[PDB]
Symmetry: C2
Subunit: 366 residues, 2 copies
Amino acid sequence: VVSKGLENVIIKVTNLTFIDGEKGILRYRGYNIEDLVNYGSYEETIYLMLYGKLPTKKELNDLKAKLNEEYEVPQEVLDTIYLMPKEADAIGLLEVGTAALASIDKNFKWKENDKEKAISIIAKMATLVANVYRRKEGNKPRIPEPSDSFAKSFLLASFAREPTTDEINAMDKALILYTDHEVPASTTAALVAASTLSDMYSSLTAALAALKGPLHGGAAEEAFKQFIEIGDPNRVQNWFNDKVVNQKNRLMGFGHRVYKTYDPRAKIFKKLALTLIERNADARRYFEIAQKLEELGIKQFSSKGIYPNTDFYSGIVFYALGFPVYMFTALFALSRTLGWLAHIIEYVEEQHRLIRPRALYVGPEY
Amino acid sequence: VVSKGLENVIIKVTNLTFIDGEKGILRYRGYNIEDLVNYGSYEETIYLMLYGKLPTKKELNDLKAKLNEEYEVPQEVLDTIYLMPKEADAIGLLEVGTAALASIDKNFKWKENDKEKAISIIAKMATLVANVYRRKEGNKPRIPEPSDSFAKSFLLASFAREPTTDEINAMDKALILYTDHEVPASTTAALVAASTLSDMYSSLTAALAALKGPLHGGAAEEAFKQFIEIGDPNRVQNWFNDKVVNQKNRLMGFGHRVYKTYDPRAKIFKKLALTLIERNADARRYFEIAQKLEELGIKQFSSKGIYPNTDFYSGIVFYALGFPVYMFTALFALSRTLGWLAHIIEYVEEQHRLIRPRALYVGPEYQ
């Protein structure tokens, strides 16, 4: 008898992420996310995830130097992306890019130096995401160059404009907030690839393969698309009364299968939206719309334990830095790449078992 | 509490493949392998797997026509494959090609025309496989042309040499024989992708990424490699006595999770190899090493319920048709693509659920 969706099945133990949905607490190796965003950066979160402890000043410096040495990608990886249609789905192009890398990285060996490898993949993930954007906007490639931070190099490479401090911060916290959460289908499929001892690019490919589906990718998009549909802050009430109240639909970006309280990263994402809305007028138009909705939603649903989740405001942040709605999932993927690599290493390094489930034959035997 | 490897977990129910590991019975939709390799083609197996029954004579002819209309692949996919290193692993190159096709295919919708779409994918996989081979040997790309069969089409594309009945037959039976078997990491990864409703080319990319691990792909290559190590039939006993007997090595091509008898499709694989080794003097030499090694092996491990499995002979058929050792898992992938499509289709149309397993958080409460 089928264990439907694997819902009640534990695929692995993890030392990586802990979520308390009663309280609304998210931790990475024991540290609350709020401490990480309040005092740290993406770089220190990478170190934590991969190596287990907070890095020394010299240990963090060393990570940062590896990252600076690894943004480059063989030209063939950029050429392939540019052979695909400009109109192609961002996640589909990420797929091709990661599959290409897989294929060029002949001579990889599990357990030799996994952590360093992962660091070089994070650096190259930045390069593809930047160029996936550029390629869909018709621009020539641009490769992240060394800088004081990973958020800065990525933004530099994307837009070719000197980002403001607030922009560097928004993108850096963004990266930490989405690093890991649960084991959705993208992590599962990565875990499945990795249990056959496949390379890390191939597991990311498989993770990206699952993320392309609409039941996994598009969360931020769909939430964000509500605001566009509203258009004007003055139309929120009629929209909410109609759609929500008496037609009984969902508030996309509300609710959660673990959180019974505000999502800890929705709190942080909103705050970052406030720091960037001054500069983009569309971004500010959607924040006022989104902020009117949230008050209407909390009055309506908090009594049933339904709160704004992380996708209600992360789109406004991304939109406010200049990324088009078609890149939200790919920005999620950039960030989630850290989580996925940690799960894979962790799996293969401490609790390796090939994955071979079973199907039950039904219908006639002869 | 953890279901290590997902071993005793029933991920889905299925009407596709039934295995009896005591009796050695392998059937597809109720039909024994023997009846299909004996009497029909790979095309008939495509129809049965996808539509659920045997094709009436014209049903099979339309499918055939459908295949024939679908070998062409956009030049960008081929350019992509030709942009990677010729020394790349072949599964890797396949992954690139399926990803390239997934992102070019912006017009896809589950539950509209799955079967027709799967048919169109099977044919493009033949082109992919044919051209991953050409690129690794350094030749210009060649696209399968319409013909009386898919095996004929594929061999022509591959070698650009007209194949023979025996050849067309061996390729075509190979395809039926590797179509489906259990739910390994490749099918599982295809299910996980399809559970989010990703596209079919993307689910294949997922399956192909998992297939590349050395713990899933490379089986037929490990069996055949042993024979090459031996070199000549006059050394079998020394090597056998050397490596296996006293040094307790693992005979490769022997052993099974489910079959504790001889693998049914190994039995047919051997026959197919007898059928083409006349032609290939190099094949026969390897076939003679193989046949003598099976003999000692069977003598050594039959009591343990360890008999030759399907990977012990397949390499010889593929080698006899002209494919190098590096194409082996790719040849399997070509075959198993059918099984992958039927499984995700069965899954999305009848048992659709999104996959979200649990992780159990052990690890610092609050550092």
